[PDB]
Symmetry: C3
Subunit: 274 residues, 3 copies
């Protein structure tokens, strides 16, 4: 959308000088529209095209800009209070809407406005930040976190305590992406724009960033920045040249098989009852 894009990219350049008071009504109404579109899935920060994920940098700008144009407000919890500038996604929903939207929200799961939640997903208690997109069939398990602008595929299982990197602090060039049908093992972390290709199974306690060597014991090939589709990755170490010590690395031990599929499947009985 050019009528929105334009205004957004104009303002971003004056980011540091914009405040909730000196901001003109145009930039305000706009930034707000672009956030409403992300909330709805009509726009998404990154998308795959011609087998390549592409980042719409300017949508990442509007996300950033919302923090310069909005002012904090007291939010009454019940036993405590909060003070923040990003509204709660579900604050206005009634049953009708939850009924039409088709997902399940387990207390005290929390989602910020500007994040897209797809039909048939289950959010156990966890956090979904602004601009993230969570596709169909996915479960975000206990204490997991879907970082700002992150892109999560359909039928994904983010295990308990899993963290998917955001792009706000520290600031990142690209969002983190988990393609369709992946299983991310408990307590694992995926950050810094790494891409986990479809059908991959990341074991527990695996940490993947741009500096992580993803080692393929079979080919001897060492990847960086992405997990090839259908891999099973687990933690290991690689030895120093002098065998003096070893440093952490991710090891692709094999390609997903029935033995693997046995342990990581989605439980349809927990999904939406048609």
């Amino acid at each position: 959308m050019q009528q929105l894009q334009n205004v957004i990219e104009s303002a971003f350049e004056r980011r540091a000088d914009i405040t909730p008071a000196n901001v003109d009504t145009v930039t305000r109404e706009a930034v707000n529209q672009v956030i409403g579109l992300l909330d709805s899935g009509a726009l998404r920060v990154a998308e795959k095209i011609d087998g390549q994920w592409v980042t719409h940098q300017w949508l990442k700008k509007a996300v950033l800009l919302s923090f310069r144009i909005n002012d904090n407000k007291v939010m009454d919890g019940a036993e405590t209070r909060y003070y923040d500038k990003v509204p709660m996604k579900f604050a206005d929903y009634d049953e009708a809407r939850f009924q039409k939207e088709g997902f399940r929200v387990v207390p005290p799961a929390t989602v910020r406005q500007g994040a897209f939640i797809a039909r048939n997903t289950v959010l156990m208690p966890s956090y979904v930040n602004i601009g993230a997109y969570v596709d169909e069939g996915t479960m975000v398990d206990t204490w997991a976190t879907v970082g700002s602008c992150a892109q999560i595929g359909k039928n994904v299982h983010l295990s308990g305590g899993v963290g998917i990197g955001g792009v706000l602090e520290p600031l990142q060039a690209n969002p983190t992406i988990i393609e369709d049908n992946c299983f991310i093992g408990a307590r694992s972390e995926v950050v810094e724009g790494v891409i986990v290709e479809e059908g991959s199974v990341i074991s527990m306690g695996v940490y993947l960033g741009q500096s992580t060597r993803i080692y393929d014991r079979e080919t001897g090939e060492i990847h960086y920045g992405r997990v090839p589709a259908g891999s099973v990755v687990v933690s290991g170490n690689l030895p120093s040249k002098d065998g003096s010590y070893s440093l952490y690395c991710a090891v692709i031990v094999k390609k997903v098989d029935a033995k693997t599929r046995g342990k990581v499947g989605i439980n349809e009985l927990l999904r939406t009852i048609d």
Copy 2:
């Protein structure tokens, strides 16, 4: 109880075809009774008998079935809203009851109905899922999670961010069990029906599943599926046949002693004041 068992096991077979509307009042009243019994500790998903832990598969069925027979309902948080089908355990408690029940619930700790919480336990902010059983004296520290049907012994310390595997998704044959007097180190995970025998101390960042080699450096013996009573386990790696790389494993470095006991004890002053 045969009058309950029977009905439950009948229905389970038609699991995929049962919905919150076509379910007959018998199966409904029953499933509901079996959940009320679990909530109360009168029944428990697994139990030790003749020095062997046994799983009552049919109680795991009722847990599963509750998701087919109940419909979602809007739950009003304060600043947001939720939409789910498993009631909150403590929603009806008054002080009298909390006073009689003898445990402490730190906001915003959350427990689902169908989980048993014993006297003198302390729940820091954390999650206890349906069907779990948490025994006397235990503390569930910050952001820890007690997975569906998991069995936690007396006087256990589940450190911050610790995750004890559930049995719902991915679906599991047996619950995860932590016997009496164990200390589970921060950010560690125990899943897939592994058993941690009494008096063991699992260090921080230890991940135990059925595929985890538990190596006893002293005996050279490699375990799978269980931690022998009184062990102290920490993370390590085992080398490839070609010394090319190494893969994660759990290492039993020693048997618990006073030096160890010094660092992992329970603080009675925090327990219930008699």
Copy 3:
């Protein structure tokens, strides 16, 4: 303050015999004053003096004593209820106050009374326990935990799921300390009075306790208990004498540089708008 110190240290000696009912009004009024001072930053459990961090053991006593002198009370969450004895810090705040205090509290971030939160900090959903002190500019990211009495410097970034050890259970001699300008990587844990010196960058999945060997590959020097200022630490392993297996250790791979600074900076746009 001697008029407070005295009373506190008197009572501590009778800790096990004091209860919310047999405690005399003096010890009660006092313990309560010392907690109000910690809440305000007027007193702090540990402080650096002459380039040495010092622990005021007697302030740690008052923290402990508050659990013996206060009785539990029902706290009404919205969808559930809690039963605990430490009030919520922000329960009384209005916008005026939040406005004057200058920090941001993202729901459902929770802080106990007795903890000091400095100006310009951002608390994503996380936990700050009694007696902790969080200095200026710092962000406590999602599901992080600042343990009882822990001391966090200015401009620190505690990543998602990071745990900073408390001193309550298990009981500890000294608090855990993170000096100014440090970045603690996702899912990492720092406990047992370890000190992370200023400007250090701890990678993801690093676990530091008193038994952790911090290995400097360059000097060959092995530290214990502290991370030398300006280090970049990541997980590795050290080999057994027989190369039979290896055990976890922290490895100082280098001194912080621009490449590093690129990935861990604070995002000022998210801080308080002056």
